Amino acid sequence: SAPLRILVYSDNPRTREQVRLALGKRIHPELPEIEYVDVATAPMAISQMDAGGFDLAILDGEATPAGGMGVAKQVKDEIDDCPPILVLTGRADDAWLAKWSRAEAAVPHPIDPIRLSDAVVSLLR
Amino acid sequence: LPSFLVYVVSMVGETNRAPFDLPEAEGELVGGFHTEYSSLKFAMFMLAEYVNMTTVSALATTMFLGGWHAPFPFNLIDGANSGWWPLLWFTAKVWTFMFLYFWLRATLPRLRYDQFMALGWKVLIPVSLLWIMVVAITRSLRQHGEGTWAAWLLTAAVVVVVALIWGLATSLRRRTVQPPPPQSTGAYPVP
Amino acid sequence: FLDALAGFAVTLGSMFKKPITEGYPEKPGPVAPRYHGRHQLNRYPDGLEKCIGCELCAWACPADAIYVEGADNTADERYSPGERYGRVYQINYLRCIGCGLCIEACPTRALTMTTEYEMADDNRADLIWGKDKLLAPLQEGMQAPPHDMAPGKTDDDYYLGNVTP
Amino acid sequence: HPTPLPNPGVYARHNSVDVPARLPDGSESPLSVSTILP
Amino acid sequence: GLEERLPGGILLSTVETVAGYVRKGSLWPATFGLACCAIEMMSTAGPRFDIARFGMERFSATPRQADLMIVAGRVSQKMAPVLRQIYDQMVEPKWVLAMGVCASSGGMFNNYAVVQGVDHVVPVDIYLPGCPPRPEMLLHAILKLHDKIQQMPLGVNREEAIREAEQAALAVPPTIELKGLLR
Amino acid sequence: AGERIVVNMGPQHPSTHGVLRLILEIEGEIITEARCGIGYLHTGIEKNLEYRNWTQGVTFVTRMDYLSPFFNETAYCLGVEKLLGITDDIPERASVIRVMLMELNRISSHLVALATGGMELGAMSAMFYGFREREEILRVFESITGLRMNHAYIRPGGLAADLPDDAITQVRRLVEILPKRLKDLEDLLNENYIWKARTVGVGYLDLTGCMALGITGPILRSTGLPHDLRKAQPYCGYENYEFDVITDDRCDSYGRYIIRVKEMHESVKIVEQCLARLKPGPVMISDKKLAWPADLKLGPDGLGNSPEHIAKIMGRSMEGLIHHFKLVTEGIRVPPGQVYVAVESPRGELGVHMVSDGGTRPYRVHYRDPSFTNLQAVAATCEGGMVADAIAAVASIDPVMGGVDR
Amino acid sequence: GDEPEIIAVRRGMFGNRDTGDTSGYGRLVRPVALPGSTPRPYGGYFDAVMDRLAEVLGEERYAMSIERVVVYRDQLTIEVSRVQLPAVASVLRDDPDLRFELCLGVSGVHYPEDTGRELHAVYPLMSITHNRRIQLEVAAPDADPHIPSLYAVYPTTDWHERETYDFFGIIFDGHPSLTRIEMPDDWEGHPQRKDYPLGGIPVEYHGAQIPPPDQRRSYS
Ligand SMILES: CC(C)=CCC/C(C)=C\CC/C(C)=C/CC/C(C)=C\CC/C(C)=C/CC/C(C)=C/CC/C(C)=C/CC/C(C)=C/CC/C(C)=C/CC1=C(C)C(=O)c2ccccc2C1=O
Ligand code: SF4
Ligand code: SF4
Ligand code: SF4
Structure with missing residues (x-):
């Protein structure tokens, strides 16, 4: 199998750590191994997405210089055959914007490990 | 002079400049025609606009302001109309026309293009055509020694036109109207 | 009849009057003495901080x-x-x-x-x-x-x- | 008389003039979208 | 563009510096404004100040000609899609100035209706405090953006700068962990 | 039928103020139907008010209809005072300064309206001259309040602080120069042939239309009805001022523009009257149980509570300290009740429905903003005309979208 | 009716919304009643307005329509019973002696503790001819938040019935199209209802953050 590569985007290193903690090397033993590419800045995330080869992108809607929802909209408008996007929302009322970002799934802060894992499995399945 | 005025109005119209400025009409159509254009394509549209301004100002200079001939304060100077000075005089006249463009832009709002077409067809075209006649008749009379008659006709003609145009500006565009009738909305009592 | 052209006389006139722009940033304009600029924490003349940490400033802040x-x-x-x-x-x-x-x-x-x-x-x-x-x-x-x-x-x-100091 | 007609509905992922507005009962309001639009 | 294919010698450095000088000047704002911050932006364009001195008087009506998007006011939920559309319909290079507290962090309106900072939807280059920022503050932020634009890299230098900025950003702790002197 | 486009004037458009969305069905370039799309500048100010005390929600209300900050503040403070039963206890100087600031703000708001309308209609220099006059007005506002916009200077029971010693001289200079400088702006537009052709007969709305949509302000008074909340239902002591309600009979865009231009001069006259009647005295109610305890003063370290007040509260007066602490932290308690208070904002009747549940926070604060109601006239004043006429009509409505959405 | 309208029951001194900081002060029970029915000799022109309204409306119809009359701070409010709102609005607009042609809008206010009357719609009406003004109040339960729309009588109530709906869910039955005007159509909930959370985010600070004001402690 091919290590599924997941892009974790957040200016906050602790959000990236939590995302990587919820999703281990294997979300389930039936699923392939997972390799994480951490990106703290929007330019790096966009360039990585352009390089392709990602199975999922987790974008923090609370990212300081460039929010995850904006990056999600940008990638789904700029990359052809871009992978499913999961957005982390800083509040419940952000749900509407999460829908606008066209992200395949939205997980509110604080990141529930189990909710995030279930959403990731659903997106990769 | 009537030909000069009609031509000047038509100059401002041709260059898409204020107070006509219709194709762009920033306040109305965002960017007008050059919306969806960026970079040097927009740059070239604006370059064409400005080159047209310069070309038509130079045409006005050629046809009405004596082209490159030196103005009166310098006309008396020997050699002013010869050598490279004519270039200076021509540039000066062209830039006076450019200043007129900028002044019009700073002072006047932009017309509705229906209003501009009304100006063109109900004022400019009739005035220019009447002037063409008047001028032809005047020159023919002068060539035949009529003299005074021409000096009369011309003046009378303009005296009429400035009045008639005034009517279009003041009489045709009436500034009074009747009040509207009330309806179910139970209008209050007016003063 | 010239009244309709009054606007021209305005702009041309202003073209010969000195521009009124403040020279910011080279020559910044004068702000009001009462202007609400950056907050500042002050000290007593001997150097002790005046702030007693009562949080009243934070309490009253509408924007937290x-x-x-x-x-x-x-x-x-x-x-x-x-x-x-x-x-x-x-x-x-x-x-x-x-x-x-x-x-x-x-x-x-x-x-x-x-x-x-x-x-x-x-x-x-x-x-x-x-x-x-x-x-x-x-x-x-x-x-x-x-x-x-x-x-x-x-x-x-x-x-x-x-x-005193 | 139908005071300025309800604007086209604004939704996440859809805000064009072709989108009808949502009535309280969840149904699309006919007046929100111009009759000419498909 | 081909300017991004140039070798990293003195040629690329000079192209970068001249492009930065050219772009810092003639930095046309988008004809865009949400609230009272828009009024202060107009005042900055007004005679008392002169945005024009910086080559920035042409508020591009269409985003195609716009180079800078001064958000200049609060961004509601329903407006964020529109603001993002305007941002995407500008042509690179683009910069976003978050004018005012509402545009930068939501300001006093910390509630459902406000996006809590336009950076949620568009990359912000400079944050401008104030409610509204007085026109001098806007000019200060604009000059800061000019300084940023002047030092903007290109091509291979741009890629190296992106990598270095990423490396630096991956290490910075979050603001919630700067517990300096907190009891 | 199938030959007419449907277009979005959209939020981002020079004449739509960035958040207004006119959806126009154009048959060629004639507006056939004109839907209005609102809420792109919704802010939750009305709900967010409910989580802040009185004297704090002032800072919120001044930011809806941000071109008329003092009007929002005055409406809010009048509502609070009426709920308190304190309207008759407000110091005379505070009321006079409120009237003076409201009229200067009317001049400023009309200047912005004229500037943006001229800019939309191509009158480029109109914006610059209007903002040049507004710059002097805002200098006065900044000196009085320390802010250029969104002032929180008018507070429940009076003002945030007394005028600075130089304020009266600056306002007198304004009274002297505003007519002369407004002469420049009027010369650009008033009699200009293009301006009149561009606005005369455009955006017509009869008195019946104004009543049906509940329009108010210059739009209504362009129908010849001299309705003004300052004469009818006087407030802040407007009854003591000799001024004429500006009204025209054209019922179109040009009539509204002329009404605003003349309202500027009427405001200048009212400000001259205010200066004549301005006398030394307190600017906040004498009741220490409600009076704002802060006493701002300037010093080498900036603006802050005056050293005398610091001495009183931290050195000698326990009651003074308690009152300062509580009135600053929790604020006053307003007896429960409902009150609808209306003022004549530059754009019409600015109404405020204020409900208190007896607590230290406004239970409910709703602004009937005149722009919200006036925008219902876009369909009437735009359908049938050209898009160029729609621009003029909307500009004549002079909608400030902060008040529209709130 | 005829009793004071309690909109909230406040218990405990110092406006504590919960158990309270200091022991022993929480036993007070103070109902928060809005001003009740005014005694008949209303002030100023309110007496004339009400007499005319009771003359135009039949005694039976008047009693069925006007639920209450309040004069607070020299302002007249008429608690108009739901259902009967269009009739009294028509009477007020059309009656020459009343002639309240200018309706200034509709304001929603939510009273989650006012059983059966949680949602109130306020209609400020002004008569320019008589230089008078009044307010109508129409209550509706949270269970059936329906009110008769005044679109036929006061077209200006259009968009107001919408705003009030958008922010409260009052259905204003009969409105030509009651669509959200401020919030997006996909929006869930009605923001200005007291039960709808403020929806803020914590304010970020170095090493700390301040929750939104709705989460933090308050006294009223
Ligand atoms: C190919 C090649 C390289 C060749 C070599 C030669 C070469 C280099 C080129 C040759 C020369 C060329 C072609 C050069 C390129 C440049 C070129 C062609 C032209 C571009 C430059 C140009 C056209 C200059 C002049 C433009 C000009 C007159 C600009 C002034 C515009 C003005 C007056 C702007 C001010 C507008 C303004 C006040 C902005 C505010 C906008 C706001 C506030 C928006 C939001 C908003 C609004 C809109 C409200 O009105 C409002 C009202 C009330 C409440 C709220 C609001 C609100 O929120
Ligand atoms: S209010 Fe209290 S905590 Fe805040 S700065 Fe003043 S003394 Fe310090
Ligand atoms: S918002 Fe808070 S910090 Fe800013 S000026 Fe007001 S009280 Fe001071
Ligand atoms: S930051 Fe202040 S001035 Fe700017 S939009 Fe927000 S409230 Fe208005």
Whole structure:
């Protein structure tokens, strides 16, 4: 199998750590191994997405210089055959914007490990 | 002079400049025609606009302001109309026309293009055509020694036109109207 | 009839009058003396911080733009007269609306608002100004804040204004 | 008389003039979208 | 563009510096404004000040000609899609100035209706405090953006700068962990 | 039928103020149907008010209809005072300064309206001259309040602080120069042939239309009805001022523009009257249980609570300290009840429904903003005309979208 | 009716919304009643307005329509019973002696503790001819938040019935199209209802953050 590569985007290193903690090397033993590419800045995330080869992108809607929802909209408008996007929302009322970002799934802060894992499995399945 | 005025109005119209400025009409159509254009394509549209301004100002200079001939304060100077000075005089006249463009832009709002077409067809075209006649008749009379008659006709003609145009500006565009009738909305009592 | 052309006479006239633009940034214009510029944490003449950390400024802030944490003025390290001083004092200038309710709230005048306004950053965090960035500069005759109160003086003396360098 | 007609509905992922507005009962309001639009 | 294919010698450095000088000047704002911050932006354009001195008087009506998007006011939930559309319909290079506390962090309106900072939807280059920022503050932020634009890299230098900025950003702790002197 | 486009004037458009969305069905370039799309500048100010005390929600209300900050503040403070039963206890100086600031703000708001309308209609220099006059007005506002916009200077029971010693001289200079400088702006537009052709007969709305949509302000008074909340239902002591309600009979865009231009001069006259009647005295109610305890003063360290007030509260007065602490932290408690208070904002009747549940926070604060109601006239004043006429009509409505959405 | 309208029951001194900081002060029970029915000799022109309204409306119809009359701070409010709102609005607009042609809008207010009357719609009406003004109040339960729309009588109530709906869910039955005007159509909930959370985010600080004001402690 091919290590599924997941892009974790957040200016906050602790959000990236939590995302990587919820999703281990294997979300389930039936699923392939997972390799994480951490990106703290929007330019790096966009360039990585352009390089392709990602199975999922987790974008923090609370990212300081460039929010995850904006990056999600940008990638789904700029990359052809871009992978499913999961957005982390800083509040419940952000749900509407999460829908606008066209992200395949939205997980509110604080990141529930189990909710995030279930959403990731659903997106990769 | 009537030909000069009609031509000047038509100059401002041709260059898409204020107070006509219709194709762009920033306040109305965002960017007008050059919306969806960026970079040097927009740059070239604006370059064409400005080159047209310069070309038509130079045409006005050629046809009405004596082209490159030196103005009166310098006309008396020997050699002013010869050598490279004519270039200076021509540039000066062209830039006076450019200043007129900028002044019009700073002072006047932009017309509705229906209003501009009304100006063109109900004022400019009739005035220019009447002037063409008047001028032809005047020159023919002068060539035949009529003299005074021409000096009369011309003046009378303009005296009429400035009045008639005034009517279009003041009489045709009436500034009074009747009040509207009330309806179910139970209008209050007016003063 | 020339009335319709009055506008021309306006613009042409202004073309010969001196432009009225303020010369900012080279020659910045004069702001009002009362302008609501950057907050500033002030000191007493001897150098002690005025802020007692009462949090009234933060309390009154409509935008929750002030964070204040008080602490005891232990004899080993005293920063303000009295029992309490504000050891952590942060203003989130991306939430500050310059209303001035904070200064009107202060009971010590520890918080004022200067006329300085030039302030901007490419980073959100950099605009959360802490105590170090807000404290007024240590003037002549002042001492480092961690020092005992002026001899033969008490908090009431500081508030009554009976202290000197 | 039908005071200025309800604007086209604004939704996440859809805000064009062709989108009808949502009535309280969840149904699309006919007046929100111009009759000419498909 | 081919300017991004140039070798990293003195040629690329000079192209970068001249492009930065050219772009810092003639930095046309988009004809865009949400609230009272828009009024202060107009005042900055007004005679008392002169945005024009900086080559920035042409407020591009269409985003195609716009180079800078001064958000200049609060961004509601329903407006964020529109603001993002305007941003995407500008042509690179683009810069976003978050004018005012509302545009930068939501300001005093910390509630459902406001986006809590336009950086949620568009990359912000400079944050401008104030409610509204006085026109001098806007000019200060604009000059800061000019300084940023002047030092903007290109091509291979741009890629190296992106990598270095990423490396630096991956290490910075979050603001919630700067517990300096907090009891 | 199938030959007419449907277009979005959209939020981002020079004449739509960035958040207004006119959806126009154009048959060629004639507006056939004109839907209005609102809420792109919704802010939750009305709900967010409910989580802040009185004297704090002032800072919120001044930011809806941000071109008329003093009007929002005055409406809010009048509502609070009426709920308190304090309207008759407000100091005379505070009321006079309120009237003076409201009229200067009317001049400023009309200047912005004229500037943006001229800019939309191509009158480029109109914006610059209007903002040149507004610059002097805002200098006065900044000196009085320390802010250029969104002032929180008018507070429940009076003002945030007394005028600075130089304020009266600056306002007198304004009274002297505003007519002369407004002469420049009027010369650009008033009699200009293009301006009149561009606005005369455009955006017509009869008195019946104004009543049906509940229009108010210059739009209504362009129908000849001299309705003004300052004469009818006087407030802040407007009854003591000799001024004429400006009204025209054209019922179109040009009539509204002339009404605003003349309202500027009427405001200048009212400000001259205010200066004549301005006398030294307190600017906040004498009741210490409600009076704002802060006493701002300037010093070498900036603006802050005056050293005398610091001495009083921290040195000698326990009651003074308690009152300062509580009135600053929790604020006053307003007896429960409902009150609808209306003022004549530059754009019409600015109404405020204020409900208190007896607590330290406004239970409910709703602004009937005149722009919200006036925008219902876009369909009437735009359908049938050209898009160029729609621009003029909308500009004549002079909608400030902050008040529209709130 | 005829009793004071309690909109909230406040218990405990110092406006504590919960158990309270200091022990022993929480036993007070103070109902928060809005001003009740005014005694008949209303002030100023309110007496004339009400007499005319009771003359135009039949005694039975008047009693069925006008639920209450309040005069607070020299302002007249008429608690108009739901259902009967269009009739009284028509009477007020059309009656020459009343002639309240200018309706200034509709304001929603939510009283989650006012059983059966949680949602109130306020209609400020002004008569320019008589230089008078009044307010109508129409209550509706949270269970059936329906009110008769005044679109036929006061077209200006259009968009107001919408705003009030958008922010409260009052259905204003009969409105030509009651669509959200401020919030997006996909929006869930009605923001200005007291039960709808403020929806803010914590304010970020170095090492700390301040929750939104709705989460933090308050006294009223
Ligand atoms: C190919 C090649 C390289 C060749 C070599 C030669 C070469 C280099 C080129 C040759 C020369 C060329 C072609 C050069 C390129 C440049 C070129 C062609 C032209 C571009 C430059 C140009 C056209 C200059 C002049 C433009 C000009 C007159 C600009 C002034 C515009 C003005 C007056 C702007 C001010 C507008 C303004 C006040 C902005 C505010 C906008 C706001 C506030 C928006 C939001 C908003 C609005 C809109 C409200 O009105 C409002 C009202 C009330 C409440 C709220 C609001 C609100 O929110
Ligand atoms: S700045 Fe003033 S109000 Fe704030 S904690 Fe310090 S003394 Fe108290
Ligand atoms: S100016 Fe107002 S918003 Fe800013 S910190 Fe002071 S009190 Fe808070
Ligand atoms: S930051 Fe202040 S001035 Fe700017 S939009 Fe927000 S409230 Fe208005």
